[PDB]
Scaffold this active site. Sequence first.
Site, mmCIF file in Angstrom:
data_model
loop_
_atom_site.group_PDB
_atom_site.id
_atom_site.type_symbol
_atom_site.label_atom_id
_atom_site.label_comp_id
_atom_site.label_asym_id
_atom_site.label_seq_id
_atom_site.Cartn_x
_atom_site.Cartn_y
_atom_site.Cartn_z
ATOM 1 N N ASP A 68 2.205 4.049 -15.179
ATOM 2 C CA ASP A 68 1.528 3.028 -14.422
ATOM 3 C C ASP A 68 0.489 3.917 -13.443
ATOM 4 O O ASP A 68 0.236 3.112 -12.133
ATOM 5 C CB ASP A 68 2.562 2.345 -13.705
ATOM 6 C CG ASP A 68 1.974 1.014 -13.000
ATOM 7 O OD1 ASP A 68 0.898 0.417 -13.423
ATOM 8 O OD2 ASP A 68 2.698 0.941 -11.658
ATOM 9 N N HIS B 156 -6.020 -12.461 -6.759
ATOM 10 C CA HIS B 156 -5.766 -11.072 -7.168
ATOM 11 C C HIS B 156 -6.668 -10.312 -7.893
ATOM 12 O O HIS B 156 -7.281 -9.094 -7.563
ATOM 13 C CB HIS B 156 -4.414 -10.918 -7.701
ATOM 14 C CG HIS B 156 -3.918 -9.229 -8.157
ATOM 15 N ND1 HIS B 156 -3.111 -8.670 -7.361
ATOM 16 C CD2 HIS B 156 -4.317 -8.440 -8.917
ATOM 17 C CE1 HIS B 156 -2.666 -7.623 -7.947
ATOM 18 N NE2 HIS B 156 -3.653 -7.234 -8.777
ATOM 19 N N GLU B 157 -7.047 -10.591 -9.004
ATOM 20 C CA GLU B 157 -7.983 -10.368 -10.043
ATOM 21 C C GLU B 157 -9.554 -10.066 -9.257
ATOM 22 O O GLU B 157 -10.190 -9.309 -9.529
ATOM 23 C CB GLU B 157 -7.839 -11.127 -11.463
ATOM 24 C CG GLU B 157 -6.757 -11.131 -12.130
ATOM 25 C CD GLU B 157 -6.094 -9.520 -12.362
ATOM 26 O OE1 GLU B 157 -6.894 -8.725 -12.206
ATOM 27 O OE2 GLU B 157 -4.814 -9.485 -12.512
HETATM 28 ZN ZN ZN Z 1 -4.194 -5.595 -9.909
#
Ligand code: ZN
EC number: 3.4.24.27
Length: 316
Positions: A226, A142-143
């Site tokens: 967010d 993901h990162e």
């Molecule tokens: Zn992310």
Amino acid sequence: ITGTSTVGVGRGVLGDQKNINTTYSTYYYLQDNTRGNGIFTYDAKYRTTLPGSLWADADNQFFASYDAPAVDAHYYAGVTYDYYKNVHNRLSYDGNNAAIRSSVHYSQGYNNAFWNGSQMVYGDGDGQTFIPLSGGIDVVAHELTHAVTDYTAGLIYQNESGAINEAISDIFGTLVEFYANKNPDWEIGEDVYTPGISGDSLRSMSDPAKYGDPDHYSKRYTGTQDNGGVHINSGIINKAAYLISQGGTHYGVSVVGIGRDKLGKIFYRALTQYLTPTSNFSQLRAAAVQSATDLYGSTSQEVASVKQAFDAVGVK
Ligand SMILES: [Zn+2]
Ligand SMILES: [Ca+2]
Ligand SMILES: [Ca+2]
Ligand SMILES: [Ca+2]
Ligand SMILES: [Ca+2]
């Protein structure tokens, strides 16, 4: 550093044992010279100063519990590199074999991981909400996929492009977990999230709503938390990728699945070929229909499933 390439052994966060590529020059360094310009893992030593110091070990064995997050950050960056190379003929995140760098032991009780524009960073967690975040292959992939996205489409990290940015990282993190066959599922972070509570996860692609995330555009978050919901609205796109791959009926719309590899190819092409920094969900639908067409034909099943899935989640 300059040295001889060698192979070490250690134990990861979940106690599994694995081999890691190291480089030897007086000490053994977590430096893998076998992949592009190299994969380098650093110790941030519980501070927030980055990158920290290149991980040095005296005997090429990595069995201290302090070592565990470094072993996995290093090993799983390698697996993710291999996935992009072998499945998509992409050399590292920039396409030209740039060095991959990660730091672990970032701060104290830090329950997150991120890409900071130049490198990956992993907290150790507080031991109750998270254990060291690099213990999850879907977290590492993901990162790293954020760097891929930054060098390609450049999706802005807010509102709808930001939710797309997040979803691409969830989609590809999952496809990498499946590629490495590490107990795969359509959940995000299950291996490192809440060690005292099994069967849960941070986010769900198969059913976002299990954790309160929208699984339909009508249900999207329109406020300002967010960065405008980038981790929340990703649920709508995550459910779409899930349907496209596995099939199912969602709000009465049936979708024939076309499997993971085609999902990967379709979304990788959308990402590298059609998405722009300001793309919104509607532009993602188009980008995806066009990739499918490019890849399988105007009247393929594949194009039909992509249309089906986006209809199902309310994205025209
Ligand atoms: Zn992310
Ligand atoms: Ca050692
Ligand atoms: Ca898993
Ligand atoms: Ca997972
Ligand atoms: Ca758990």
